[PDB]
Design a protein around this ligand. Structure first.
Ligand SMILES: [Ca+2]
Ligand SMILES: [Cl-]
Ligand SMILES: [Cl-]
Ligand code: NA
Length: 189
C-alpha cells in the first residue's frame, strides 16, 4: 500500500537525525528527505523481523537512539535496525503501570508518553486525561510522534500539531485536525 493512499496510520517512531518510520498494516515507510525512493513500502517483517500491524512506537533521544515497537502485551527494542538480545519483553515487565494494547507513544526531545483510549501515562527511565493536558487533542489517537519543538497526534486520516512549550494545538490554516497525506507528508495532489 502506497504511503500517500490517504488511509490512517498505526504508529510512528520519533524524529531521529531527520528520519522516522511510519507503520500501516504490514508496511514500514522510512520517512527521510534523502531517500532515493522516499516512502517506498517495505514489509514490517522484512525491515524489523516481526509481524504487523504494530500498536505504537517511539525512539529514544540519547546517543544509542533505540527504537521500541509495541504489539499487544509485548515490545521489541532495536539498535541500528537490529533486535537487542532477550527481546521481545512484556510491556508489564519493562514499563511498570503501562497497560497492554496501547494506541500510541512518543519520546520527548527523558520522558515517554503512552496513549490508550482517553488516557495517557508518563514513563521516566498514574493515568491522566489526554484532552485535559494536551489542549486541542481529542480523547483517542491512532499514533503519535515527537519532532524538535512539536508533537503530532494522528486520528484517522488527519493529525494535530501540539507546541511543546504551551502544550496547545497550534493555530494554523486550514486548522487542525487536517489531512496527513496533504499537510504532514506533502503527498502529490
Ligand atoms: Ca496505534
Ligand atoms: Cl505511535
Ligand atoms: Cl518540530
Ligand atoms: Na510514536
Amino acid at each position: 500500500m502506497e504511503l500517500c493512499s490517504g488511509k490512517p496510520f498505526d504508529a510512528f517512531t520519533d524524529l531521529k537525525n531527520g528520519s522516522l518510520f511510519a507503520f500501516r498494516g504490514q508496511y514500514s515507510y522510512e520517512l527521510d528527505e534523502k531517500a532515493v525512493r522516499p516512502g517506498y513500502p517495505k514489509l514490517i517483517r522484512d525491515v524489523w523481523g516481526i509481524e504487523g500491524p504494530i500498536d505504537a512506537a517511539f525512539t529514544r533521544i540519547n546517543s544509542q537512539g533505540k527504537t521500541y515497537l509495541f504489539k499487544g502485551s509485548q515490545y521489541w527494542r532495536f539498535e541500528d535496525g537490529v533486535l537487542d538480545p532477550d527481546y521481545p519483553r512484556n510491556i508489564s515487565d519493562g514499563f511498570d503501570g503501562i497497560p497492554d494494547n496501547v494506541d500510541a507513544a512518543l519520546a520527548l526531545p527523558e520522558r515517554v508518553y503512552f496513549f490508550k483510549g482517553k488516557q495517557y501515562w508518563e514513563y521516566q527511565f498514574q493515568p491522566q486525561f489526554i484532552s485535559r493536558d494536551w489542549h486541542g487533542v481529542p480523547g483517542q489517537v491512532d499514533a503519535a510522534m515527537a519532532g524538535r519543538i512539536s508533537v503530532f497526534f494522528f486520528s484517522g486520516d488527519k493529525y494535530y500539531r501540539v507546541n511543546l512549550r504551551t502544550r496547545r494545538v497550534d493555530t494554523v490554516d486550514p486548522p487542525y485536525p487536517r489531512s496527513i497525506a496533504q499537510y504532514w507528508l506533502g503527498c502529490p495532489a
